[PDB]
Design a binder for this molecule. Structure first.
Ligand SMILES: Nc1ccn([C@@H]2O[C@H](COP(=O)(O)OP(=O)(O)OC[C@H]3Oc4nc5nc(N)nc(O)c5nc4C(S)=C3S)[C@@H](O)[C@H]2O)c(=O)n1
Ligand code: FES
Ligand code: FES
Length: 906
């Protein structure tokens, strides 16, 4: 060891470090400059970017031995604080460039360094800078980030003033539909926002640090676990196994469908007799530090008997395959889909035009910049309190309580920390029971943190769909029948697997009036990573095949792909694939708005193709519902305060999409008659001991269901304040009358669950999108590049423009990674952020445009619908169609990697 004096943010600092310490750990653990985040931990995400002696570097790959004496270091805390904000922070906030905000510090530091060298960079300049510096963002779609940089540049040049680009309160007083920054913006652009890992530095002394001892084989029987050596290791307080669990040591699927072959009780908290997938946690180590715990976990020995490994749906379907879950077939669920008349006479008729095909959607990894993390402790009332990224706190409490041997809500409390994105993986419990297990055994606060390799090998994935479907149309182009078949590879754990399978009966071919449908669905258990909901939850996987086949049918009929769609879309008379009348009929109108953009891309693409680079254009229609199937309910309370302000209590979980902006905009709008201003609406959210059951932030339901519960609770407060015949009471007069201050609100969606053949009215609101893309294909290699994206959308009235804009940009970006680069197949190649193929800035076109068709929803709060999962419904189908359109190559098996595009090239 040696002391090194280094100047941090203008001040000298003598630090007692070890030459092998990583600059990132030093800055975090010793200087508590928590704004410097550790994402991938391998220098790919740039989330740990700091400026070291004028050079922009990634602090996670810098040894202390390589850092000079008196070296100057600049972190976000050296750029601006909440009281003395930098123009770069102001632009970020005014553009809504910070969603989950986990990559914000790295992007801002990196940007500030760019401006020191170039006061007037072009958008392209900025894009290259982030590209060269590995600044990754999984939320924004990048566009907002560049928009923010360009504005801060004009301000530093003295061309625009801060007050000039900032949101100003209208004479209206209304913030519903405005571009008002989100409540959490400031905390996020300053690096004060505390994420799970950051909290580890601020916990009490006696806090313990966990490490998991994971299985490295995919399938096996457990003959024994030897904790002996790990116990003897330095710093280890205790080592737990399945023997230390008090409850059933199982996680229930809760809502497991009645006709499922299994019972939803197969997931162990800590495996006891079998290993179902690579990553499986067989023991928990408790140490005085993370480094000490991780090091002792490797020293835990397993006595196993290797069983065959079924790494795909087909394999687990082979007739000789053994049951992964003894006493339950690997195909534990069958889904029927029957609408209209029998479809066989339509396919057997030589006079119809038939198009058939087999497609495949991959096991897409969520790739959040922040790996999983959470902590827990014993309450001052004897309750186990667990903090995590859970986006369904009430649901997860119920899913884990029995296996821990606890009772909700008397022994257990769940709290959602500030989340650095989930994109769905948190609809599933990840480490909530593990932390709870540890907390109960020791009685002390425990903090569990996953490295990026665990975020990859031990969190759910999008489940791959194998689809074989076909259309039967007449010579004029009208689709008369459709037959579909799909198989969902769900890994070993069934939570929500059957529900996902039903999603196929609802969405394959959605958006078109197809009178007769016959299909068969299937949920199959495999030994690959289990399935956790992924933004789209059934839409991206169902609509990819139907939208690609649609273009294949168009070619067989000799009709334009865009015009063909325009011909079959919903119209008065048509119903969905569940037999439900669509809540709005704006499709014809959406096609009309899209048409001008389509025909221009048609000319522009032909007029720009090179002999070495062919360019093409592709379209696709995506549809998804807002809300969970059936009578989906939400709760919320509003309480009047003495100073006349209001405190809103809800459980609108935030993945970083902007649940805060949504609660505020909805409350404010509903509280109009009382004149409440935005700064007078306090928010108490996501804590089962304080906030009501609002339901999960999944299914793109929050804005509609929860929005309505918030709306309702406000209307009750308004009525509670009514002075007999004359106006309103005051917080003062209210107290005197002994009148209640808090008002509870609830709302139930007017929908009905689907029956055994997939029919019914499962969602009250839908989200519709028309995608158009211009892709360039390098004929020589097969490397495709999305050059432009236009998206016409109908999501009802907008609650917050910055939020919805940022949601569409972000959604379209993941759409590109889904089509061109992402996957979780090879356990070693796909265990790192870059390996799995997360899109870097240059992969996303700077040229993205959005057109909104604000048709209002009868059942939405103020006529609004969801937006969450809409931008990921069919943008991948569009990219794929574009590629065929460019070079004639047709890829039905995602992702369309270069060599894959090459193979398919006629
Ligand atoms: N007409 C509308 C509709 C929605 N919104 C806003 O848009 C956001 C998304 O609303 P909604 O579609 O109702 O979805 P939820 O709040 O239920 O969020 C869940 C959704 O959010 C998504 N967006 C994400 N965005 C980010 N940055 N990170 C994630 O992990 C995200 N996870 C995905 C996934 S997956 C899901 S299911 C909310 O801030 C809402 O207030 C709006 O301003 N106006
Ligand atoms: S680049 Fe350092 S944590 Fe990712
Ligand atoms: S805002 Fe960039 S990763 Fe979430």
């Amino acid at each position: 060891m040696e002391t090194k004096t280094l100047i941090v943010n203008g001040m000298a600092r003598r630090l007692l470090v070890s030459p092998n310490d990583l600059l990132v750990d030093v800055l975090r653990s010793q200087l508590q400059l928590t704004s410097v985040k550790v994402g991938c931990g391998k220098g790919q995400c740039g989330a740990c970017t700091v400026i070291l002696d004028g050079k922009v570097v990634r602090a996670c790959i810098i040894k202390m031995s390589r850092v000079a004496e008196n070296a100057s270091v600049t972190t976000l805390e050296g750029i601006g604080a909440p009281d003395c904000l930098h123009p770069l922070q102001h632009a970020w906030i005014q553009h809504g460039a910070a969603q989950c905000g986990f990559c914000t510090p790295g992007f801002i530091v990196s940007a500030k360094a760019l401006l020191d060298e170039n006061v007037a960079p072009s958008r392209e300049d900025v894009r290259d800078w982030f590209q060269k510096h590995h600044n990754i963002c999984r939320c924004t779609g990048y566009k907002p980030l560049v928009d923010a940089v360009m504005d801060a540049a004009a301000i530093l040049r003295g061309e625009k003033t801060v007050e000039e680009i900032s949101f100003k309160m209208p004479a209206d007083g209304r913030i519903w539909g405005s571009s008002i920054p989100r409540p959490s913006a400031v905390a996020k652009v300053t690096g004060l926002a505390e994420f799970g890992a950051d909290a580890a530095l601020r916990m009490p002394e006696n806090t313990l640090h966990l490490a998991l001892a994971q299985a490295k084989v995919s399938h096996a029987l457990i003959k024994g676990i030897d904790t002996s050596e790990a116990e003897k290791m330095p710093g280890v307080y205790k080592v737990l196994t399945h023997k230390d669990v008090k409850g059933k040591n199982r996680i229930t699927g809760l809502i497991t469908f009645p006709t499922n072959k299994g019972d939803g009780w197969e997931r162990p908290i800590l495996n006891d007799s079998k290993i179902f997938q690579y990553g499986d946690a067989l023991a928990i180590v408790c140490a005085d530090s993370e480094a000490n715990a991780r090091a002792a976990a490797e020293k835990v020995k397993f006595d196993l008997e290797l069983l065959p490994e079924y790494m795909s749906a087909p394999e687990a379907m082979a007739p000789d395959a053994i049951e992964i879950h003894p006493g339950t077939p690997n195909v534990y669920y069958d889904q029927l889909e029957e609408k209209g008349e029998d479809t066989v006479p339509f396919f057997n008729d030589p006079a119809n035009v038939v198009a058939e095909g087999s497609y495949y959607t991959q096991r897409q990894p969520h790739l959040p910049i922040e790996p999983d993390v959470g902590y827990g402790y014993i309450n001052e009332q004897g309750q186990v309190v667990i903090h995590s990224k859970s986006v369904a706190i009430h649901l997860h409490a119920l899913m884990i309580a029995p296996g821990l041997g606890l009772e909700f809500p008397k022994d257990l409390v769940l709290v959602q920390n500030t989340t650095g994105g989930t994109f769905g993986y948190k609809f599933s419990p990840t480490m909530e029971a593990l932390v709870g297990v540890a907390v109960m055994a020791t009685g002390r606060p425990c903090h569990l943190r996953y490295n990026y390799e665990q975020q990859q090998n031990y969190t759910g994935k999008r489940s791959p769909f194998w689809t074989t479907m076909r259309y039967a149309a007449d010579r004029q182009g009208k689709i008369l029948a459709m037959e579909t078949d799909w198989s969902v590879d769900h890994g070993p754990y069934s939570e929500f697997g059957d529900l996902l399978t039903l999603r196929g009966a609802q969405y394959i071919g959605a958006g078109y009036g197809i009178a007769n449908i016959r299909g068969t669905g299937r949920t199959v258990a495999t030994n690959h990573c289990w399935g956790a909901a992924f933004r789209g939850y059934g839409a991206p996987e169902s609509e990819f095949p139907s939208e690609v086949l649609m273009d294949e049918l168009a070619e067989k009929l000799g009709m334009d792909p865009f015009e063909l769609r325009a011909l079959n879309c919903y119209r008065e008379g048509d119903t969905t694939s569940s037999g439900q009348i669509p809540e709005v009929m704006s499709l014809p109108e959406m096609f009309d708005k899209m048409r001008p953009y389509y025909e221009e891309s048609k000319k522009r693409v032909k007029e720009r193709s090179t002999a070495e680079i062919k360019r093409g254009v592709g379209v696709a229609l995506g549809v998804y519902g807002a809300g969970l199937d059936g009578p989906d309910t939400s709760e919320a309370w509003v309480e009047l305060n003495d100073d006349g302000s209001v405190t809103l209590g809800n459980s609108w979980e935030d993945h970083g999409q902007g649940a805060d902006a949504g609660s505020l905009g909805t409350a404010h709008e509903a509280l109009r008659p009382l004149g409440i201003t935005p700064e007078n609406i306090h928010l108490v959210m996501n804590d089962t001991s304080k906030t009501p059951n609002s339901g999960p932030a999944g299914g793109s339901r929050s804005q509609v269901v929860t929005g309505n519960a918030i709306r309702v609770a406000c209307e009750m407060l308004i009525e509670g304040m009514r002075k007999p015949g004359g106006g309103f009471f005051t917080p003062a007069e209210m107290k005197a009358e002994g009148r209640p201050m808090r008002y509870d609100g609830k709302w139930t969606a007017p929908a009905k669950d689907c029956d055994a053949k997939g029919q019914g009215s499962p969602f009250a609101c839908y989200m519709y999108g028309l995608f158009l893309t211009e892709v360039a294909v390098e004929v020589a290699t097969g490397k495709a590049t999305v050059e432009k994206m236009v998206c016409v959308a109908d999501i009802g009235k907008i609650c917050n423009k910055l939020v919805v804009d940022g949601q569409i940009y972000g959604g379209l970006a993941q759409g590109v990674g889904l089509a061109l680069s992402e996957d979780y197949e090879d356990l070693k190649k796909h265990s790192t952020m870059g390996g799995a193929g997360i899109p870097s800035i240059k992969m996303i076109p700077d040229d993205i445009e959005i057109v909104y068709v604000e048709t209002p929803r009868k059942d939405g709060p103020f006529g609004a619908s969801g937006v969450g999962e809409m931008p990921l419904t069919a943008p991948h189908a569009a990219i794929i169609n574009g590629i065929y359109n460019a070079c004639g190559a047709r890829v039905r098996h995602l992702p369309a990697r270069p060599e894959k595009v090459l193979e398919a090239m006629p």
